[model samples]
Target: DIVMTQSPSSLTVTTGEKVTMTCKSSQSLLNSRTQKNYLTWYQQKPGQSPKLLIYWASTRESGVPDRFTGSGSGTDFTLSISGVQAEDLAVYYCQNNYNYPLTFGAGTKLELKRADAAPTVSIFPPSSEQLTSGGASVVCFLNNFYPKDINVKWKIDGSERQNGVLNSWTDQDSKDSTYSMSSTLTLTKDEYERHNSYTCEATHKTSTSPIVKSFNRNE
Candidate 1:
C-alpha cells in the first residue's frame, strides 16, 4: 500500500483564475502489472458527496468540465483547474485504488474570494416530446459574472437534484473580463413529466442573494 500526501492544505482563488495542486505518493502509483497509474482525484463540496474528477492520472470522468485537468506519474501527480468558478470551491483529495487497503490524501480546500458581480442566469427546458423519448435535458446558462467563481445547483419542485448533471468549462470574456458557464441536467422521461417546477440557482461569494431562474412545465 502506498501513502498519498497533498500539499497546500488550502487555497483561495478568484473567478476566471487558474490554480494547480500537487499529490505525492510514498511509492510509485504506476502499476507494474497494468502499466497505468493508479491515482484518482475527487472533489467534495460542502453538502455533496465526493465526485470523481480524474482517474488513471490524466483521464477525466465522463462529462467533467474541461477546465479540470490531471497530470504527472509515478510518485508525483498534479491536478489543475483553469478559469476557476465559484462553484469550484470545495475540498479535493487524491486516492490510490490500485491496491487493497486504499488510501487518500489529507485533502485540499479551495475557497473563493469576494467578487464584484453576481451571475445572470437563465434556464431552458426541453419539450414534452423530448421528455417522452427519455432524452430530456434542461440547461442553465450563467453569464457576466465577475471574479469567476460560481456554484450552480438544480432543483425539482424545490428539492435539489443530484443525478446526471454535466457542467461546461467556464469561459472568460476578455472584453470586460467576465465569466460564463453552462450546466446541463438530464432527466428520465418519468422524472421530467412528474416534476412541474425546475430551478437553477447560482451562488457567488460577493452576492448577498443567489441568482435563480425557474421553469414550469405549463410554461
Candidate 2:
C-alpha cells in the first residue's frame, strides 16, 4: 500500500502570513507519458466537505483563490498559501488518485498560534457498533488536541498489539479549532476472554507521556 504523509501536521499562523507545506507519497505520483502528477489537494472547512483546491499536481481547480498554489511532482508536492486569510482557517489534505486505490495525507491545519492544546483520551467499551461479527472490540477516543500529530498504540495483557489496529483521521472542531480522532481494536472473543486487560495509549507532542487507559471488562 502506498502511504501518504504531510508535514507540519498542523500550522499556527496569523491572517496575513504566508504558509507552505509538503505532501509525500511512498510511490511516485508522476506518470511516464506526461509530466503531470495525479495528485489532488483539498481544503476542508470546519463542518463542511473537503473542497477541491488543486488537481493534476499544479493546476488549480478553477475558482480557487489565487493565493493558493500547488507545486512539485513525482513523490513530493508542495501547497502554498501566499497570504493566509481569516477564512483560510481549515485543514488541508492531499490525495493521490494515480492508482485504483486512493491514498490520502494525514492533513495539515492552519490556526491561531495560541490555539494549541493537549489531547484528552478515553476508551469506550465496545457496544453493538457493527456487532464485530465474531470478535470483541473497543474504541479509543482522543479529543481537544492541536497540532494533530499524535501516536497511538494498543496492548493486551501488557503485550504490544502491532496488527489489526484502526485509526481515524484527525477531525477538526469547527468553532474551537481543536482536533479529535478515534482508534479501534478488535479480536476474537476467545482472545478477549483469555486476556484480562486491553489497553489504548496515545501521545502528542504537547505531552511527554502517553495517555493510557484500559477497557473495563467488569462493567
Candidate 3:
C-alpha cells in the first residue's frame, strides 16, 4: 500500500472560478504486470473525513461525471478540472483505493470568497435501473444556485456495497451562482437488481440539510 497526500487544505474562489489539487502516492504503484496504477478520489466536506471517488486508474467510481476524469496509469496520475463554479468550492482529495491501507490526501478546502469562510468546508458520488449484459449504470445530477461544496454517496438497502466504479463531475453555471455535480455508478446487470434501494446522498458544506435521491430498479 502507498500513502497519499494533498496540498492547499483550503481555497477561496469567486462565483466563477476554478482550482486544482495534487494527489501523490508515497510509493510507486505501477503494476509491473498490468502496467496500471490504482488511484481513487474523494470530497470531504465539514463533518465527513473522506469518500471514494475514482479507483483503478481512469475508472471513475460508481457515480461520477464526464468532466471528472482519472488519467495516468502508473506512479504518475492526474485529476483534471474543467469549469469551476461557486458551488464547486469545497475540500477535495485523491487516494489509491486499489490497495489496502487505503490512503487519502490532506484535503483542499474550497470557498467562494476569501471572507465569510467559516466551518472548515470541502467540496465533493450514484444509482441503478436495469439488468442487462451491457451492464447498468446510475448517475446523480444536481442543480441549483449557490457557492458551497457538496458530497454524494451510494447505498443498497441501507447497507454499503463495495467493488463498483464511481465518478464525479462539476460544471460552470453562466446563469447564476448555482452549480451542479454529477456522480455515476457502474455495475453489472445482476448487481443492479440484487439490492433493494439505491440512494444518492448529497451533503452541503455550509448547512446540515442533506439532499437524498432514491431509485428502485424494479420501478
For candidate 3, the per-residue lDDT at 193 reads 61
Rank by TM-score, highest first.
1, 2, 3
Model 3: per-residue Cα lDDT over 21-61, one tens digit each: 66777787667777768676776554556665676767776
Candidate 1 local distance difference test against the native = 0.84
Better of 1 and 3 by TM-score: 1
Model 1 misplacement above 4 A = 116-219
Clashes of 3: 27
lDDT of each: 0.84, 0.82, 0.60
lDDT of each residue in 102-154, candidate 2, tens digit only? 98899998875445688788887656544446567778888888878889988
Return the TM-score for candidate 1, rounded to 2 decimals. 0.53
Model 3, residue 171: displacement in angstroms? 21
**What lDDT is reached at residue 184 by model 1?**
94
TM-score of 2: 0.53
Give the distance in Å from residue 139's predicted Cα in candidate 1 to where it truly belongs.
Answer: 36
Report the number of the highest-lDDT candidate. 1
